[PDB]
């Protein structure tokens, strides 16, 4: 009910999960998916196969919205952070460009004990 | 009195009345603090690398001056108080260190 025909795709990948949000050219989201949206529940959500399935499910929902041309934004690191982009390439969506926009601070905040 | 370089980045969208007004206000600030104006370079419209005050562009000014030291910070404050002036960087003048001479 939107007929967007083009937009962005953000891939947020961590070591616990990978989620994909397909949005429109001025930033508002259209659809999304993740390792928990699909069947997987626990650490299974962080596997590259779950990332592939999440990307494919989000891409098919975007097809339902009528998406053809997609620009890719990537933030984070984890298993399947690349597999998401591979499935997104071979999903039937013409990939416009891939961009890694992983937010990194200029050393402002103190991390948790795990990250030091 | 030391030699300084005042960089002024202000709103680009001004028309001539507003721009001349802001420039003459900068002039009056330079007068009131004892700033002898040695030279001036007005670049104007320029493409910023990152948006400043929600605007992707800015209007540039550069003044090489000679003024007393203890007044530089107060002059910078008075220059900043103006709304349309978005950036004020006063820099002590230096000699042109070259490279690949």
């Amino acid at each position: 009910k939107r007929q967007v025909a083009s937009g962005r795709a953000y891939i947020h990948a961590s070591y616990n999960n990978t989620i994909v949000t397909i949005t429109d050219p001025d930033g508002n989201p259209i659809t999304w998916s993740s390792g928990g949206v699909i069947g997987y529940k626990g650490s299974r959500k962080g596997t590259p196969y779950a990332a592939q399935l999440a990307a494919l499910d989000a891409a098919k929902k975007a097809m339902a919205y009528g998406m053809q041309s997609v620009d890719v934004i990537v933030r984070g690191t984890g298993a399947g952070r690349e597999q998401a982009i591979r499935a997104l390439q071979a999903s039937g969506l013409q990939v416009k460009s891939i961009v890694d926009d992983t937010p990194v601070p200029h050393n402002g905040c103190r991390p948790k004990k795990k990250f030091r | 009195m030391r030699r300084y370089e005042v960089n002024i980045v202000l709103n680009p969208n001004l028309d001539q009345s507003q721009l001349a007004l802001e420039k003459e206000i900068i002039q009056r600030a330079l007068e009131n603090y004892g700033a002898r104006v040695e030279k001036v370079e007005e670049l104007g419209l320029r493409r910023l690398a990152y948006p400043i005050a929600k605007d992707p562009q800015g209007y540039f000014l550069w003044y090489q001056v000679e003024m007393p030291e203890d007044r530089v910070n107060d002059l910078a404050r008075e220059l900043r108080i103006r709304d349309n002036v978005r950036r004020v960087m006063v820099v002590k003048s230096q000699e042109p260190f070259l490279a690949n001479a």
Binding site: V74, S97, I98, V99, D100, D101 | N7, V9, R46, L48, A49, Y50, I52, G58, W62, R87, M89, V91, Q94, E95, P96, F97, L98, A99, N100, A101
Partner: protein, 70 residues
């Protein structure tokens, strides 16, 4: 690979306003290039870093950028 200073003129390392030549010393991202790729001396690099930061605060050089093709 070519180092920045190798292909360049007799330019001012203290001019924070010349974006044309200071852009050469930034990476694909907004990061300052190491001495391995700039071919500068320690003193030259130390001056270039401060001039680059000055240009950044004046909105002339990017504080950070986005990586492509990743």
């Amino acid at each position: 690979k070519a180092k920045v200073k190798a292909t360049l003129g007799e330019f001012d390392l203290r001019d924070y306003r010349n974006v044309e030549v200071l852009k050469r010393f930034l990476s694909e991202t907004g990061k300052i290039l190491p001495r391995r790729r700039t071919g500068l001396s320690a003193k030259e690099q130390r001056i270039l870093a401060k001039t680059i930061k000055r240009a950044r605060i004046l909105g002339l050089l990017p504080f950070t950028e986005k990586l492509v093709r990743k």
